Design a protein around this ligand. Structure first.
Ligand SMILES: [Mg+2]
Ligand SMILES: [Mg+2]
Ligand SMILES: [Mg+2]
Ligand SMILES: [Mg+2]
Ligand SMILES: [Mg+2]
Ligand SMILES: [Mg+2]
Ligand SMILES: [Mg+2]
Ligand SMILES: [Mg+2]
Ligand SMILES: [Mg+2]
Ligand SMILES: [Mg+2]
Ligand SMILES: [Mg+2]
Ligand SMILES: [Mg+2]
Ligand SMILES: [Mg+2]
Ligand SMILES: [Mg+2]
Ligand SMILES: [Mg+2]
Ligand SMILES: [Mg+2]
Ligand SMILES: [Mg+2]
Ligand SMILES: [Mg+2]
Ligand SMILES: [Mg+2]
Ligand SMILES: [Mg+2]
Ligand SMILES: [Mg+2]
Ligand SMILES: [Mg+2]
Ligand SMILES: [Mg+2]
Ligand SMILES: [Mg+2]
Ligand SMILES: [Mg+2]
Ligand SMILES: [Mg+2]
Ligand SMILES: [Mg+2]
Ligand SMILES: [Mg+2]
Ligand SMILES: [Mg+2]
Ligand SMILES: [Mg+2]
Ligand SMILES: [Mg+2]
Ligand SMILES: [Mg+2]
Ligand SMILES: [Mg+2]
Ligand SMILES: [Mg+2]
Ligand SMILES: [Mg+2]
Ligand SMILES: [Mg+2]
Ligand SMILES: [Mg+2]
Ligand SMILES: [Mg+2]
Ligand SMILES: [Mg+2]
Ligand SMILES: [Mg+2]
Ligand SMILES: [Mg+2]
Ligand SMILES: [Mg+2]
Ligand SMILES: [Mg+2]
Ligand SMILES: [Mg+2]
Ligand SMILES: [Mg+2]
Ligand SMILES: [Mg+2]
Ligand SMILES: [Mg+2]
Ligand SMILES: [Mg+2]
Ligand SMILES: [Mg+2]
Ligand SMILES: [Mg+2]
Ligand SMILES: [Mg+2]
Ligand SMILES: [Mg+2]
Ligand SMILES: [Mg+2]
Ligand SMILES: [Mg+2]
Ligand SMILES: [Mg+2]
Ligand SMILES: [Mg+2]
Ligand SMILES: [Mg+2]
Ligand SMILES: [Mg+2]
Ligand SMILES: [Mg+2]
Ligand SMILES: [Mg+2]
Ligand SMILES: [Mg+2]
Ligand SMILES: [Mg+2]
Ligand SMILES: [Mg+2]
Ligand SMILES: [Mg+2]
Ligand SMILES: [Mg+2]
Ligand SMILES: [Mg+2]
Ligand SMILES: [Mg+2]
Ligand SMILES: [Mg+2]
Ligand SMILES: [Mg+2]
Ligand SMILES: [Mg+2]
Ligand SMILES: [Mg+2]
Ligand SMILES: [Mg+2]
Ligand SMILES: [Mg+2]
Ligand SMILES: [Mg+2]
Ligand SMILES: [Mg+2]
Ligand SMILES: [Mg+2]
Ligand SMILES: [Mg+2]
Ligand SMILES: [Mg+2]
Ligand SMILES: [Mg+2]
Ligand SMILES: [Mg+2]
Ligand SMILES: [Mg+2]
Ligand SMILES: [Mg+2]
Ligand SMILES: [Mg+2]
Ligand SMILES: [Mg+2]
Ligand SMILES: [Mg+2]
Ligand SMILES: [Mg+2]
Ligand SMILES: [Mg+2]
Ligand SMILES: [Mg+2]
Ligand SMILES: [Mg+2]
Ligand SMILES: [Mg+2]
Ligand SMILES: [Mg+2]
Lengths: 156, 124, 145, 63
RNA sequence: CGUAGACGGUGAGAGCCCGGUACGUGAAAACCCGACGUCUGUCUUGAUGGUGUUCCCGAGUAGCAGCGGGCCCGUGGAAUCUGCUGUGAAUCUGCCGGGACCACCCGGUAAGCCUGAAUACUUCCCAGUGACCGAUAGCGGAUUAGUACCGUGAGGGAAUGGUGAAAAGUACCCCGGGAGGGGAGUGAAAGAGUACCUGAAACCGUGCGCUUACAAUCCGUCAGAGCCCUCGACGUGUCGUGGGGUGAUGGCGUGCCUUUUGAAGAAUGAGCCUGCGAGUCAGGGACAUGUCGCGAGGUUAACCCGGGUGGGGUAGCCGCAGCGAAAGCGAGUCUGAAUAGGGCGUAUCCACACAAGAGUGUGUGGUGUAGUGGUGUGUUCUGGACCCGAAGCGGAGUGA
RNA sequence: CUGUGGGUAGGGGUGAAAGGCCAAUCAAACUCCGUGAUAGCUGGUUCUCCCCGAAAUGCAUUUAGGUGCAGCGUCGCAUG
RNA sequence: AAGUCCAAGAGUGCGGCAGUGAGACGGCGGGGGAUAAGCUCCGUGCGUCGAGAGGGAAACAGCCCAGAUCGCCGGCUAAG
RNA sequence: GGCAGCCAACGUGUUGGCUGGGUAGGGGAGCGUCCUGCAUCCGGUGAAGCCGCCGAGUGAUCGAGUGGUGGAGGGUGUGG
């Protein structure tokens, strides 16, 4: 009601009019007026303790290993030649599930570029792994360098 | 997220009017006048659901008193004699018999007078 | 076999939010304020108790000052040192910081509430009589800077 | 808007170790002539605030 | 097929149809930021380290007296800054700062001048995003929009989107002066014909079934005959663990919300419908209640690096010892002349000894102490803080 | 008396004086702004079920139609 | 000292939550009033209504009998 | 005959004893709407909205239950 345009003056007199008492043209009761409790631009960042996130990710990964959906691949596609079809054939031979998660080192670009277009497959760098993407996909695949770096960072 | 109010009010108001079908005037056409006397109607239903047992028992006893006086005995004497004889038949069945078998009442009044004591004013 | 489908909150971790004044079935016509009154309109000040002078108003103040130039230390227990040093030996500010008994920057003092049975060489700033006697009786040394 | 403590209460009230609120007795600023000495002796010193006003005061100090 | 499965349309859910998307390319001319060759300007009359002794370095200023402002500081014991008015200093054994005040020592040189980098803001332009709205919402304005209209004023301030796939928007005939309509045709549909998707409720009828013109009524409910329709077994209508619509006739029967001790009240509000309309929101804010991890440790803000929620970040925060105003002491502390008792605490208990049994206190040996953080809920604080509502107070402008 | 043309602006004007008039409004005009002025005052507060279940008392109040405390309520914990 | 002791959901302390502080009637003991009010002010381990459905006194909160989990075209009763 | 709360015994939820009127008010458990996440699915062989019939739940209601209009989007589940 305090931000709408105009109508800062009394619509009419108190007594003698016969109609109900009002105070502003832009009252929430009126049509075209303001809203009773208006929302404002805002944020919902929730801080979660590091043990909380690490423990949750560790539980998710432990369940994944228990269900036997973790694998090792030395390289996804041949170097200096991005080929989405080769990656598709490789993943089809390797597994038959609809969605597969692959962890690839940052410096490897050809594999990510080749696998980007396909929709049910997603690629994440080992430093960018998160619980939501772990839970979303059906199969999870580790590259050798990525798994080694992740294990070393965990143990350090 | 703004939730503008299309079906939520409509479902409940329609169920109110649908339950209120069969009245006169604004009663069966208008909501604000339906819910009020809808609740009044159902409150009347609640009250007279208890009142119905009383009214039926009243009619039942009235018919039994009629039959007893036709057979030349009073209601109180008939009931007292029946209790003395130890017959556990209830006013529903007595009333249906009075509608049905005066032979049944003839036997019943005979039993009642047989079970009736010698003197009704004895100190016992 | 857990999917994003198989995620549930802890039993009782979720309590329903109360919608007040959302129908006479649960909370109606008053919104938990009851009948008429200033509490039914806005509020009452916390420090206001009907006009009479509040308990923060008809009471004297505490005398004396706060001594803004106060020097602060932290006590370290002789029993705690004995428990954390079964082998014993020389102990210093860095050693206590590593052991996590006091803040790293904060200045340390000790007292002799506990008992000492292991030879411990103590380096500190302020020594009390009880801690001094405990150190001397335990066949050790404790020097103060 | 960080909650503001009550400056009046803080200058008058202080907290014990266990969370009790201890307070300094009233009726000693002036007019001590006719007050008996034994009246004052039971009157100086501190005491814990009664549980009746503890709830209201606890809201005052921490705001 | 895919280094392009973003997005719209085409007669219905299209990456294989197009607009197009990954990816490459490309400017004759012009504009803003980034290098590379005449020419211009300065000093190498100058420069670096070495032994005693005779007007300048910012003036009506610092400061002072009164009177006022702004730093938390509201003349309080009041430093520091500034201003109006009067007075008014030294040039280095000079000064003022070091929170009314100074002896010895301790740190900086006032009245002169400017200076990029971190920051705030977005009328405008570009590219995107949305558990933001979808025509009483969202900007007042999806359409003649600050238009119509009101007020000569400063000004106030509206309502009004959808045919269809495309206008293929109904040739022609007939009734009618036209408006309006019926066929014939268009179209999938004209129960889509421009008053045009879906078309409810209040609203106004028609036709059908039943009831009602001896009838005293918050209008309904509980019984309840008759009439009409329907479903099965049995014949022409009769029952059957029957439904439906009406209901003649009897019992009971004083609308709803407020505010009240008290309402059918002849106390308040509602003519009706369709929508709109009320405990919401931010903080390392605080308390208590469930939930999660670690544990004598629990943890981060701001901020740095990843088209991404991730990793770093020990500055702080809350309990781990309290007592006292305090110096200070410390499982004790304060009061006190005092083991002489008290107040507060030593998490709480069990067992062993001593006293009175003035109710419990006093010393030993054991199990040995639980808070912090986010999540959600109730309350509380400051914000307008559940919503609507006054005559009135101040500033700026418009009009005799 | 009247046409024309101008000047006097809100705590101000003007006022053969009535608290008259200043654009149908005047014991302080009108429009915007602070402004969601402020309300111990009135009204309203929308889905359902299950359990428990009050007071109209005392104290004090620039207080009596509000408020805070105590009793009366509910939920949990503890001695049972 | 006993009795309910598969619980009155009894007591006391602490913690989280708001309501109330406008009562009325009747029976008792009273003041004022004129032993007048449906009056006022008290007391009541008084009751009722408030915050209560049913029957009875024609209607009628407060009097009399009696505590509505739901249903039954079942029986026994209280006041009357 | 049925639902619901408390309690005792035993068990991997039956039996048995009580209670269930309630305004302000407290506590507990739920229905429905919009918008997102995902596993997936429905839908021109007719979705949503619109208007009925029959059923079922102790309630807010539900029916992946169907009839007439409509011609373009929605739903289960667990979450927020
Ligand atoms: Mg409105
Ligand atoms: Mg708006
Ligand atoms: Mg939140
Ligand atoms: Mg009827
Ligand atoms: Mg009141
Ligand atoms: Mg009210
Ligand atoms: Mg109140
Ligand atoms: Mg303070
Ligand atoms: Mg003194
Ligand atoms: Mg004396
Ligand atoms: Mg209290
Ligand atoms: Mg696409
Ligand atoms: Mg499909
Ligand atoms: Mg699409
Ligand atoms: Mg296309
Ligand atoms: Mg000052
Ligand atoms: Mg000063
Ligand atoms: Mg100088
Ligand atoms: Mg300067
Ligand atoms: Mg800068
Ligand atoms: Mg519409
Ligand atoms: Mg005009
Ligand atoms: Mg055709
Ligand atoms: Mg139309
Ligand atoms: Mg249409
Ligand atoms: Mg008729
Ligand atoms: Mg007749
Ligand atoms: Mg009637
Ligand atoms: Mg009736
Ligand atoms: Mg009657
Ligand atoms: Mg209402
Ligand atoms: Mg009144
Ligand atoms: Mg009342
Ligand atoms: Mg009255
Ligand atoms: Mg009337
Ligand atoms: Mg009146
Ligand atoms: Mg009236
Ligand atoms: Mg009324
Ligand atoms: Mg009134
Ligand atoms: Mg009216
Ligand atoms: Mg009208
Ligand atoms: Mg808070
Ligand atoms: Mg907690
Ligand atoms: Mg980080
Ligand atoms: Mg202290
Ligand atoms: Mg002393
Ligand atoms: Mg002592
Ligand atoms: Mg914990
Ligand atoms: Mg003003
Ligand atoms: Mg003028
Ligand atoms: Mg002017
Ligand atoms: Mg006069
Ligand atoms: Mg006058
Ligand atoms: Mg006038
Ligand atoms: Mg004035
Ligand atoms: Mg005006
Ligand atoms: Mg203001
Ligand atoms: Mg404004
Ligand atoms: Mg206002
Ligand atoms: Mg207010
Ligand atoms: Mg009112
Ligand atoms: Mg009860
Ligand atoms: Mg009062
Ligand atoms: Mg019980
Ligand atoms: Mg309590
Ligand atoms: Mg409360
Ligand atoms: Mg009173
Ligand atoms: Mg009173
Ligand atoms: Mg009284
Ligand atoms: Mg009276
Ligand atoms: Mg009375
Ligand atoms: Mg009397
Ligand atoms: Mg008397
Ligand atoms: Mg009175
Ligand atoms: Mg009495
Ligand atoms: Mg009341
Ligand atoms: Mg009654
Ligand atoms: Mg009662
Ligand atoms: Mg009665
Ligand atoms: Mg009962
Ligand atoms: Mg049981
Ligand atoms: Mg109940
Ligand atoms: Mg309630
Ligand atoms: Mg179709
Ligand atoms: Mg069809
Ligand atoms: Mg269908
Ligand atoms: Mg259609
Ligand atoms: Mg949907
Ligand atoms: Mg649904
Ligand atoms: Mg979910
Ligand atoms: Mg949910």
């Amino acid at each position: 009601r305090g931000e709408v345009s105009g109508g800062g003056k009394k619509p009419y007199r108190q007594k003698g009019t016969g109609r109900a008492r009002q105070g502003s043209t832009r009252a929430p009761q009126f049509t075209g007026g303001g809203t009773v409790h208006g929302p404002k631009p805002r944020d919902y960042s929730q801080r979660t303790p590091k043990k909380m996130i690490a423990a949750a990710l560790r539980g998710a990964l432990s369940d994944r290993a228990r269900n036997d959906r973790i694998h090792a691949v030395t390289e996804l596609v041949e170097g200096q030649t991005p080929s989405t079809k080769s990656a598709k054939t490789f993943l089809g031979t390797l597994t038959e599930n609809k969605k597969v998660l692959v962890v690839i080192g940052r410096t490897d670009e050809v594999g990510a570029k080749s696998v980007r277009n396909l929709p049910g497959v997603h690629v994440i760098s080992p430093d960018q792994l998160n619980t939501y993407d772990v839970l979303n996909a059906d199969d999870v695949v580790f590259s050798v360098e990525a798994l080694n770096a992740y294990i070393s960072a965990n143990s350090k | 997220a703004r939730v503008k109010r299309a079906l939520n009010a409509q479902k409940k108001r329609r169920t109110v009017l649908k339950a209120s079908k069969g009245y006169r005037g604004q009663r069966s056409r208008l909501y604000r006048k339906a819910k009020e006397q809808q609740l009044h109607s159902l409150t009347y239903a609640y009250r007279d659901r208890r009142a119905r047992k009383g009214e039926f028992r009243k009619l039942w006893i009235s018919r039994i008193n009629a039959a007893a006086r036709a057979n030349d005995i009073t209601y109180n004497r008939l009931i007292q004699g029946l209790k003395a004889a130890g017959v556990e038949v209830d006013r529903k069945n007595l009333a249906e018999l009075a509608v049905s078998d005066p032979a049944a009442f003839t036997a019943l009044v005979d039993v009642a007078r047989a079970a009736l004591p010698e003197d009704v004013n004895a100190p016992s | 076999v857990i999917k994003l489908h198989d995620l549930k909150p802890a039993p009782g971790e979720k309590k329903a939010k109360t919608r007040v004044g959302r129908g006479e079935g649960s909370k109606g016509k008053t919104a938990g304020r009851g009948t008429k009154g200033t509490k039914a309109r806005k509020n009452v000040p916390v420090m206001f108790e009907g006009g009479q002078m509040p308990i923060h108003m008809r009471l004297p103040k505490l005398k004396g000052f706060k001594n803004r130039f106060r020097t602060e230390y932290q006590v370290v227990n002789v029993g705690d040192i004995n428990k954390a040093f079964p082998q014993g030996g020389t102990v210093g500010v860095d050693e206590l910081v590593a052991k996590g008994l006091v803040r790293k920057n904060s200045l340390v003092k000790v007292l002799g509430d506990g008992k000492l049975t292991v030879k411990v060489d103590v380096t500190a700033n302020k020594f009390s009589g009880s801690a001094r006697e405990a150190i001397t009786a335990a066949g050790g040394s404790a020097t103060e800077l | 808007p960080k909650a503001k403590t009550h400056s009046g209460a803080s200058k008058r009230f202080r907290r014990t170790g266990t969370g009790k609120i201890v307070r300094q007795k009233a009726n000693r600023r002036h007019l001590l002539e006719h007050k008996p000495t034994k009246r004052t002796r039971r009157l100086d010193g501190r005491t814990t605030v009664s549980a009746a006003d503890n709830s209201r005061i606890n809201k005052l100090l921490n705001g």
